[model samples]
Target chain A: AMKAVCVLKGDGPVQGTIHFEQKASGEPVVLSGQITGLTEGQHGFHVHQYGDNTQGCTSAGPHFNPHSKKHGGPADEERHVGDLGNVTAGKDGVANVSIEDRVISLSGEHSIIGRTMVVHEKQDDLGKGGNEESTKTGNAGSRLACGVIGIAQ
Target chain B: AMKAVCVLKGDGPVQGTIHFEQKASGEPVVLSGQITGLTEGQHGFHVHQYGDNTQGCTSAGPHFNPHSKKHGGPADEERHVGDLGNVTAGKDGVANVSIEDRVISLSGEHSIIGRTMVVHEKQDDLGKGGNEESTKTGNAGSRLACGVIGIAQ
Candidate 1:
């Protein structure tokens, strides 16, 4: 199993860090972290395809999808493999989350080593019963924030 | 109370949009929104403090907070007032969230007019025993994605 710790820093009102651990077991990837400097409320989050931070978040390509599937829920059998999920902020403007995934891997061919994380300006629909595109996912539009995952030291 | 909407766009794999609504009713405020365009999993999300999108997300500032509080869970009373909460991405990578608070507002005194949203590269610790900054919001690092909140139309 390969582990990597990703760190992100910024000015006031918006700052945080995350730790990612991926193994070769093909079981699931373990993700955990905390964030600070935010309004007391909910926000959107997800993993992108690329890892190029040069263009800010524009360099991160689309959601990580080695499977070339449409966007959908995490449990959906037919959906993008990179689709992780979302996090929320508290009344104190801080957000804490922990989750695991079976489709995503840390090493080998299906690893997310060079992927990027994306923050949305709104919430995702999770392919419920919205638009056609939304039916696949939520149509969560716009790129709000971004970060890249790398090998930890 | 007033309402506002923010939008962001980028050339990354995980692209989407979100809606933030702030309602002020007394001391505390209420904020809510929905996210779309995820693959099919769960991801971490949160609100940044800054409004300046300098270098895209780097300028979004930190979480929105006039007071300096440690990184704590959104529901932690001993934490900062900017803590909002977490959003979960379903199997289709979409999330629908609605939360209330006392710190965030749309207009008037307790308003988050000039703030930004940030996406992390990993899951949040939820103020658990982990990284050194766990007590301060679990050290949710990395600036995966970001966007600024603008006045609603």
Candidate 2:
């Protein structure tokens, strides 16, 4: 029942919603949502550390890294808790996304109700970049657009 | 068996102590520290969501509140667990402070170690700023200094 929507754009940004609810079985939770206004290509994406973007994309902080692991793809066990892989936009610049995380929850210390979501101008490279950013944030480029993930009523 | 130190710009952020002693107790911790290089004024302070500051202070993320409460003063019951309180720097731009908290712990639930400490530039009106900043950070100003709360030797 958790949904985080991102209406990413340059210069201007706003808030989105990421709702979460436990299921009867399996991973116990299902996470899905859509993000619009992206480049017509793959972009680095993540759940940032802050929901308040007063300082623009930078204010949303880094990816929500609870496990303290090196930057890796979403399927890698050694990765930040906020990594949800990439969001690819069609020729229309829209990204319909889906993900299920065992570590992310709406009812725990790791709850991300007040965190943020960000889209980078370049690909995340999934920690393969040769720079320092690769060790932490996949060397994701300057935040092209962003949105705060909040609780939906 | 528990302690932490702040790490950021300069020769680190604080030179005080964070001692978590054993007790037949409920929380079993008392956190305290002294930090310098702050402006001669009130600064909002908190234990950020991550010990990872690879992206600078912003990478440290927002204040840690496992209970998911609105931003408030350290004295407020509804405040974030990381809402340790404000640090006042004297004319010398140094802030010496102490803490005795019930919600801040060293073990499970509400531990302080493995987190980041953020010292802001302006006063955190303790969430009374009547705006979104207040609800998130009490309107704390720019991050003057930051440090990771690591295991003290």
Candidate 3:
């Protein structure tokens, strides 16, 4: 089993720490951590395909969807494997998210290790909008920050 | 997406970004990048076991040698997996490194993805110092900067 953590960095003052904890059973692992210095709004979070941040989060690629699913929320069954839903930031510019993701895991084939975890500028549409771009990226705005998901120390 | 990058962070202002790109054939990937703001001398460059920079470079653990090898230069076959030798800076301060490493790879058992990387304050003795610390870290001085390796698009 593998539990990963990501330390984010981008061109802005936004920095974060994300932790993926392995589940004791077959349940979803815990995605918990604090992301400080963000706007007070909904930000999209996902497990991107690649972990490159050379040109910022643009190099991280799209979300990590191996099953060819649509872009949806963390609880949505018909969603990309990387779609982990949104994290709302407070007025203090901090987003502390802690929840059990259904499609995210630390072991087995669906493990979320060795991927690039990204934070978006806008909220995810959860594939509700009837548009072409909606199905692609859920209409999440620019990539604010990102980091490589590696096994936690 | 066989390429990768790392952002170094430490006590001083010796920040850097390292790049890793795979060769066209089966040859080892190229670890080339420009590291500015150096102290104008030989600095130890290596890949550590963990990419956790939470506790500075100390939490990154020792050199990344899963084979339990000793510390040596990059040319030494029997050396730590992370030993990439030194990056010399000029009087003004800058180390534009461009080298092909054999023990490192973009994909395979020796892949350095998700591992910690760092540059030290002093030069690496390559285990020839005849001391216990020399065998461990090649007598590389303080950890100047470090970051985790991630895939590049």
Most accurate candidate by lDDT:
3
**Highest TM-score, which number?**
3
Task: Give the C-alpha miss distance for residue A36 in model 1, angstroms.
Answer: 2.7
The segments of candidate 3 whose C-alpha lies over 4 angstroms from its true place after superposition are: A11-13, A23-28, A39-41, A66-69, A90-93, A102-114, B23-26
Ranking by TM-score: 3, 2, 1
DockQ metric, candidate 1: 0.02
B104, model 1: CA deviation in Å? 50
Ranking by lDDT: 3, 2, 1
Kindly list the per-residue Cα lDDT of model 2 for residues B1-153, writing each as its tens digit.
Answer: 544344334234433333334342475456555667667888887877765433456766789878889998878978998897787888987777766677676556676555666777788899888899899998887776665453332
TM-score (C-alpha, index-matched) for candidate 3: 0.85
Q: Write the per-residue lDDT of candidate 3 for residues B78-134, one digit (tens) a residue.
A: 798889888888887888888788787756667677788889988999888899898
Q: Could you report the Cα RMSD, in angstroms, for every candidate shown? A: 20.4, 10.2, 3.0
Docking class of 2: incorrect
What's the count of clashing pairs in each model shown?
A: 114, 8, 1
- TM-score of candidate 3's A chain against the true A chain: 0.93
Runs in model 1 deviating more than 4 A are A9-13, A38-41, A132-137, B1-153
Tens-digit lDDT string for candidate 2 (A15-119):
222234545323444555555666778878787776544455676677888777788888887788788668777887766665667766554666554456677
DockQ of each: 0.02, 0.04, 0.43
Q: Which candidate is the best by DockQ?
A: 3
Model 2 alpha-carbon drift over 4 Å, by segment: A1-153, B10-25
